[PDB]
Ligand binder design. Structure first.
Ligand SMILES: O[C@@H]1[C@@H](O)[C@H](O[C@@H]2CO[C@@H](O[C@@H]3CO[C@@H](O[C@@H]4CO[C@@H](O[C@@H]5CO[C@@H](O)[C@H](O)[C@H]5O)[C@H](O)[C@H]4O)[C@H](O)[C@H]3O)[C@H](O)[C@H]2O)OC[C@H]1O
Ligand SMILES: [Cl-]
Ligand SMILES: [Cl-]
Ligand SMILES: [Cl-]
Ligand SMILES: [Zn+2]
Ligand SMILES: [Zn+2]
Ligand SMILES: [Zn+2]
Ligand SMILES: [Zn+2]
Ligand SMILES: [Zn+2]
Ligand SMILES: [Zn+2]
Ligand SMILES: [Zn+2]
Ligand SMILES: [Zn+2]
Ligand SMILES: [Zn+2]
Length: 371
């Protein structure tokens, strides 16, 4: 099956249109890149901001709101009949730090006096409410799906002990969802989003958290499974079990940040795309074949599958593609093997079904057929 230009291959959204939308994460510069635009128009019917809707992009100083970059995604989406997802209202990752400073500019995590800690809690929660309010009041008629909180459960199975949690405890999660529902109304759909949702003890900690929150009337419509996965891990059986277990709570599932890395963890990458052997693309294609067959089997529990980029020329996985060199300067990709130094984030991953030249990969054929 040939390595033809994606730009006029059979449309990926159309293949799956009764099963789930097919989305892509974008940067605004891609909306001014001819090829990226034609890719979005041709293959996708859902869109998400990779970065420009994060808290630090939207409100980098209190009261200073930058909607200009988000607005461009929204406009493009509306003009092309795409669903939009909002990524994300609340996250621990370089939030703007002003959220977590007390009335004197001191970090709130340092306060020892209980009455002052409680005032800080209330103050952070008010700030959270205003951030959400302002965003949802602006986009509630345009944006259907919302990542309300991101990565709030730790890999150890405990609530992630971020400044949100240290200052406000569990109420930050409750307040985030209540606020989104209050200002956005009943027709926006609210998600909790996380990675390694398939993995214990995180998976059961997430299930227990969401079950409790719903029992308490906190409005949560679904779970976003970031799905930053590998060729051989996690298994399809474990993916299946995860999806089924949340759907049994009455939750929607979205696959929100799908990519299939060529590597393991910590990754030992090839230094360029050219160096990735052909067989890796075939192993990737068989993985995508199995994965999309599974998503199709569960299509009544999954409303969306979104890739965390467009084509292999741009992927955040490159920032993790560390290149290992032996003493003679040869590249090392075997996870156990000797090496002398590492160049962090300098290699090249290849995670999508579309190549860096915008031609289809063997993974594309694996998911566009009906076998
Ligand atoms: O442009 C960039 C943006 O794209 C970027 O977007 C955000 C990045 O993605 C989301 O967060 C990251 C998800 O991946 C996590 O790493 C995990 C760590 O755990 C590993 O688990 C192991 C895998 O191998 C097994 O065998 C082992 O037993 C497991 O424990 C897993 O492989 C990794 O993927 C990162 O820590 C997260 O940050 C986020 O929501 C997107 O918004 O943001 C930055 C920007 O520069
Ligand atoms: Cl190349
Ligand atoms: Cl398939
Ligand atoms: Cl990126
Ligand atoms: Zn389309
Ligand atoms: Zn379409
Ligand atoms: Zn090449
Ligand atoms: Zn090259
Ligand atoms: Zn569906
Ligand atoms: Zn990017
Ligand atoms: Zn190529
Ligand atoms: Zn090519
Ligand atoms: Zn197939």
């Amino acid at each position: 099956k040939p390595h033809i230009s994606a730009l006029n291959a059979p449309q990926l959204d159309q293949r799956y249109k009764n099963e789930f939308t097919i989305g892509a994460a974008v940067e605004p510069y891609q909306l001014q890149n001819e090829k990226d635009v034609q890719m979005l128009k041709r293959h996708f019917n859902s869109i998400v901001a990779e970065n420009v809707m994060k808290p630090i992009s939207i409100q980098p100083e209190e009261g200073k709101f930058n909607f200009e970059q988000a607005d461009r995604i929204v406009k493009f989406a509306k003009a092309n009949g795409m669903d939009i997802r909002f990524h994300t209202l609340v996250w621990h990752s370089q939030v703007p730090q002003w959220f977590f400073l007390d009335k004197e500019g001191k970090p709130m995590v340092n306060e020892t006096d209980p009455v002052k800690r409680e005032q800080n809690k209330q103050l952070l929660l008010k700030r959270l409410e205003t951030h959400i309010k302002t965003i949802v009041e602006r986009y509630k008629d345009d944006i259907k799906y919302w990542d309300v909180v991101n990565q709030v459960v730790g890999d150890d199975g405990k609530l992630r002990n971020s400044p949100w949690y240290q200052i406000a405890g569990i109420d930050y999660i409750k307040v985030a969802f209540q606020a989104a529902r209050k200002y956005g109304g009943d027709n926006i759909k609210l998600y909790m989003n996380d990675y390694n949702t398939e993995v214990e003890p995180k998976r059961t900690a997430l299930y227990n958290l969401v079950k409790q929150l719903k029992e308490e009337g906190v409005p949560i419509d679904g779970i976003g499974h970031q799905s930053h996965i590998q060729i051989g891990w996690p298994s399809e059986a474990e993916i299946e079990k995860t999806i089924n277990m949340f759907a049994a709570l009455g939750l929607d599932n979205q696959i929100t940040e799908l990519d299939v890395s060529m590597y393991g963890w910590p990754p030992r990458a090839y230094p360029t795309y050219d160096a990735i052997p052909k067989q890796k693309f075939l192993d990737q294609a068989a993985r995508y074949d199995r994965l999309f067959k599974l998503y199709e089997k569960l299509s009544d529990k999954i409303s969306n599958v979104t890739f965390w980029g467009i084509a292999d020329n741009h992927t955040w996985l490159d920032s993790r593609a560390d290149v290992y060199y032996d003493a003679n300067g040869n590249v090392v990709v075997d996870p156990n093997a000797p090496y002398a130094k590492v160049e962090k984030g300098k290699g090249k991953d290849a995670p999508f079904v579309f190549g860096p030249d915008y031609k289809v990969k063997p993974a594309y054929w694996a998911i566009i057929d009906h076998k």
